[PDB]
């Protein structure tokens, strides 16, 4: 599908509210496998199961290993930009 830019607002006591799978070592992108109800990703409205996360706050995640992506994603705070695509 089309590449999208999506804004997510997170408070400091929360996680992103997603589960991710995949990663470079598996030959696939960082993929959203869950959107947890009522948590920031669900609330932002623009992130969905099956979306590949291409970048977060300008950090490219297309060639990142699974745990690298976890560290990068969990570091982001507040108003967080995502670049995503559903394939």
């Amino acid at each position: 599908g089309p590449i999208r830019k999506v804004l997510l607002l997170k408070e400091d006591h929360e996680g992103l509210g997603i589960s991710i799978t995949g990663g470079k070592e598996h030959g696939v992108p960082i993929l959203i496998s869950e959107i947890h109800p009522g948590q920031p990703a669900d609330r932002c409205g623009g992130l969905h199961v099956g979306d590949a996360i291409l970048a977060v706050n300008g950090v490219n995640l297309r060639d990142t290993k699974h745990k690298e992506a976890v560290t990068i994603l969990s570091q982001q705070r507040g108003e967080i930009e995502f670049e995503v695509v559903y394939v």
Binding site: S19, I20, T21, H36, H66, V70, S74
Partner: peptide, 10 residues
């Protein structure tokens, strides 16, 4: 389902 890739809750 298959669980060959890791999943992380974040």
């Amino acid at each position: 389902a298959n669980s060959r890739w890791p999943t992380s809750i974040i």
